[PDB]
């Protein structure tokens, strides 16, 4: 059924979101970030104020 297809899609999305939630945050979301911790020249690419 179409409902079953939608349910499968939500299962895929929930798996992906669970993996994101357990996964360690990106470098920009540690609060204090050091030059060594982040990738080299990351700030140039990113937009910060």
């Amino acid at each position: 059924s179409s409902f079953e297809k939608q349910q499968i899609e939500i299962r895929k999305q929930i798996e992906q979101l669970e993996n994101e939630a357990v996964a360690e945050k990106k470098w920009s979301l540690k609060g204090e970030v050091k030059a060594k911790d982040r990738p080299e020249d990351a700030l140039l690419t990113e937009e910060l104020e």
């Binding site: 080299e40 020249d41 140039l44 690419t45 937009e47």
Partner: peptide, 21 residues
Amino acid sequence: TLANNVESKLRDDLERLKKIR
């Protein structure tokens, strides 16, 4: 090898700056 990677990073930065510009 390393110099090539540095060149590639410079190109990527230049492209992003152009995209802002």
